[PDB]
Design a protein around this ligand. Structure first.
Ligand SMILES: Nc1nc2c(ncn2[C@@H]2O[C@H](COP(=O)(O)OP(=O)(O)OP(O)(O)=S)[C@@H](O)[C@H]2O)c(=O)[nH]1
Ligand SMILES: [Mg+2]
Lengths: 164, 142
């Protein structure tokens, strides 16, 4: 089958790990364990085709920012996650995007913008603002909740389609 | 049934650093090399977290000192990444492969040098780490 190398990036505490464990194990982890760098493997069916997702879940913590180069070289697609009650994390998508482009020497890298934690009542980052950001970058925008599982498959599967 | 479930609790106890809960789970037959979905063993989680006692205990109980998770990290990669010196030492005295490569070709030295852990770099070189080792992009530790 075709293997897709997916990389999940974003700021501390946005739900990168909770999204990923939802995809792999279908369960929601309420507990913060800070990620260094973890790999997960899932054989799935997308658009009627069997394929393998090789998923790297990365560190939000800036102390590991020197490891970014390496996973930016190896990844085929990037799930760019922010949390909808975390302005800084939305703004940080810019820094992630810029580094990706510089490492791949390209403006067209498969990428999906993920607005996580859409189950939450109040929010500080507008849906419109995110839709605009994704239209600027020419990439899809998906609203997710790792807690409810909303949009979880959609987000990863959409990144796969972008790699194709 | 039970045996699998002891593994998951051993993983948790090793991560959460409960030194004595580890001792019990082992004596109820738990698997010392139980894997989480990311491929970590208890020794990876204990090395990552910096729990020296738990690292010693797991090694006394036949833990695979060069086990690799799904990213290709050994426990020595994890201890080095975050500067846990005495852990790096103990792992090495128990036969850790000093030049083990992750899936991208990085040794422990690559990671220690990348994150500026100078005391780990020195101890790694004293234990036969290769200064000219290249990862899969041709890049040395520096
Ligand atoms: N309400 C809600 N909480 C969430 C959601 N996703 C994650 N969380 C919670 O946020 C906290 C941090 O999530 P986590 O997945 O660990 O962040 P991270 O992005 O991996 O952080 P890091 O490893 O780079 S340091 C956890 O308590 C988790 O339960 C969500 O969709 N909704
Ligand atoms: Mg995480």
């Amino acid at each position: 089958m075709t293997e897709y190398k997916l990389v999940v990036v974003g700021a501390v505490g946005v739900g990168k790990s909770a999204l990923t464990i939802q995809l792999i194990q279908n369960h929601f982890v309420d507990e913060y364990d800070p990620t260094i760098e973890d790999s997960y493997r899932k054989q799935v069916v997308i658009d009627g085709e069997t394929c393998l997702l090789d998923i790297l879940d990365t560190a939000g913590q800036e102390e590991y920012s020197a490891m970014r180069d390496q996973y930016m070289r190896t990844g085929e697609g990037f799930l760019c996650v922010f949390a909808i009650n975390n302005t800084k994390s939305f703004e940080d998508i810019h820094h992630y995007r810029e580094q990706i482009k510089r490492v791949k020497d390209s403006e067209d890298v498969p990428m999906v913008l993920v607005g996580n934690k859409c189950d939450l009542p109040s929010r500080t980052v507008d849906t419109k603002q995110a839709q605009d950001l994704a239209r600027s970058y020419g990439i899809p925008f998906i609203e997710t909740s790792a807690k409810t599982r909303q949009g979880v498959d959609d987000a990863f599967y959409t990144l796969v389609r972008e790699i194709r | 049934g039970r045996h699998m479930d002891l593994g998951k609790k051993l993983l948790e106890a090793a991560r959460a650093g409960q030194d004595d809960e580890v001792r019990i789970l082992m004596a109820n037959g738990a698997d010392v090399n139980a894997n989480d979905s990311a491929g970590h063993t208890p020794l990876h989680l204990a090395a990552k977290r910096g729990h020296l006692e738990i690292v010693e205990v797991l090694l006394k109980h036949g833990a695979d000192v060069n086990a690799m998770d799904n990213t290709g990290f050994t426990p020595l990669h994890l201890a080095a990444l975050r500067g846990h010196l005495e852990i790096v030492e103990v792992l090495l005295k128990n036969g850790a492969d000093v030049n083990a490569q992750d899936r991208t070709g990085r040794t422990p030295l690559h990671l220690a040098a990348k994150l500026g852990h100078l005391e780990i770099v020195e101890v790694l070189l004293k234990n036969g780490a290769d200064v000219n080792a290249q990862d899969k992009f041709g890049k040395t530790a520096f």
